[PDB]
């Protein structure tokens, strides 16, 4: 049946896409014809990863879609606002976009779908917070938001503000806040919560990594990661949360990390290297 792989693309240079399979631990080539994007966003859905969003020397206005059976590249028209630092994910047959910046605008309320059946982007009601570099994930058809960032590096601050939109009533409900205020950290479902990983603030890198209580509406830490940086690639496959990429502030991370959320257990993998392009986009894909 299923038959899951973590993808992270970084243009086309040899070995700068990549198939990472949790249950052999290999590595293995994707054919990539399109050079690297600037602050972009990935997202799955039925059997296509879209890349959409980000910049090289002007806003990208095309998404560009990898069907991951037939192992070829097609493209359509991109979110109707071009946006770096933007966050995405599907649920349902629509693929949403939310918040990013633009020229002129340090962060975007904005939140766009498109729908995949249709071919078509509408817009939707706009997040309660603009952010940048916050993350996005689906659980049980809710879509959440949290963290990132407004403003500059000066005067503006990193987020712990957490949201969630139910695409059923298409409003966006405050919910409790982070402990940390986090960007460019991980966040993936796994079961019945919600975790968020690493990232950055306003005071530096983190190490630390929490998670939410969908039912009780709280965030609890765990145990922290084995590395401190500034970013963090991260996707889980089952019960296993894979941190495969990094930048640390001044190198990389260099061997992946792995974190049993049923033991909350962080181990770093000595015979695994870590993915050497720091700012990939990262999705989970099934390849059925």
């Given at each position: 049946?299923?038959?899951?792989?973590?993808?992270?693309?970084?243009?086309?240079?040899?070995?700068?896409?990549?198939?990472?399979?949790?249950?052999?631990?290999?590595?293995?080539?994707?054919?990539?014809?399109?050079?690297?994007?600037?602050?972009?966003?990935?997202?799955?859905?039925?059997?296509?990863?879209?890349?959409?969003?980000?910049?090289?020397?002007?806003?990208?206005?095309?998404?560009?879609?990898?069907?991951?059976?037939?192992?070829?590249?097609?493209?359509?028209?991109?979110?109707?606002?071009?946006?770096?630092?933007?966050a995405?994910c599907?649920?349902?047959?629509?693929?949403?976009?939310s918040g990013?910046?633009?020229?002129?605008?340090?962060?975007?309320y904005?939140?766009?779908?498109?729908?995949?059946?249709?071919?078509?982007?509408?817009?939707?009601?706009?997040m309660l917070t603009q952010r940048?570099?916050h993350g996005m994930v689906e659980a049980n058809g809710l879509i959440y938001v949290c963290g990132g960032s407004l403003?500059?590096?000066?005067?503006?601050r990193v987020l712990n503000s957490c949201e969630v939109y139910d695409?059923?009533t298409?409003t966006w409900t405050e919910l409790c806040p982070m402990i940390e205020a986090r960007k460019?950290h991980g966040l993936v479902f796994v079961k019945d919560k919600i975790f968020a990983v690493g990232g950055?603030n306003?005071?530096?890198?983190l190490?630390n990594v929490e998670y939410y209580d969908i039912k009780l509406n709280e965030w609890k830490m765990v145990?922290?990661?084995?590395?401190?940086?500034?970013?963090?690639?991260?996707?889980?496959?089952?019960?296993?949360?894979?941190?495969?990429?990094?930048?640390?502030?001044?190198?990389?991370?260099?061997?992946?990390?792995?974190?049993?959320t049923?033991?909350?257990?962080?181990?770093?993998?000595?015979?695994?290297?870590?993915?050497?392009?720091?700012?990939?986009?990262?999705?989970?894909?099934?390849?059925?």
């Amino acid at each position: 049946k299923h038959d899951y792989r973590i993808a992270l693309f970084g243009g086309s240079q040899p070995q700068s896409c990549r198939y990472f399979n949790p249950k052999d631990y290999s590595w293995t080539d994707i054919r990539c014809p399109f050079e690297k994007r600037r602050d972009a966003a990935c997202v799955f859905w039925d059997n296509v990863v879209y890349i959409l969003g980000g910049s090289q020397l002007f806003p990208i206005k095309r998404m560009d879609c990898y069907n991951v059976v037939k192992d070829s590249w097609y493209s359509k028209l991109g979110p109707p606002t071009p946006r770096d630092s933007l966050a995405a994910c599907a649920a349902e047959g629509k693929i949403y976009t939310s918040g990013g910046s633009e020229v002129g605008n340090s962060a975007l309320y904005l939140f766009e779908c498109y729908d995949t059946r249709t071919e078509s982007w509408h817009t939707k009601p706009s997040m309660l917070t603009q952010r940048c570099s916050h993350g996005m994930v689906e659980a049980n058809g809710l879509i959440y938001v949290c963290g990132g960032s407004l403003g500059n590096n000066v005067s503006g601050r990193v987020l712990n503000s957490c949201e969630v939109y139910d695409p059923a009533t298409e409003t966006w409900t405050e919910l409790c806040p982070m402990i940390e205020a986090r960007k460019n950290h991980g966040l993936v479902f796994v079961k019945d919560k919600i975790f968020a990983v690493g990232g950055q603030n306003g005071l530096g890198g983190l190490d630390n990594v929490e998670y939410y209580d969908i039912k009780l509406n709280e965030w609890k830490m765990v145990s922290p990661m084995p590395w401190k940086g500034v970013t963090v690639k991260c996707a889980a496959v089952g019960s296993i949360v894979y941190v495969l990429a990094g930048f640390q502030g001044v190198g990389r991370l260099g061997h992946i990390l792995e974190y049993n959320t049923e033991t909350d257990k962080w181990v770093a993998n000595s015979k695994v290297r870590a993915f050497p392009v720091t700012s990939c986009l990262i999705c989970v894909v099934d390849t059925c």
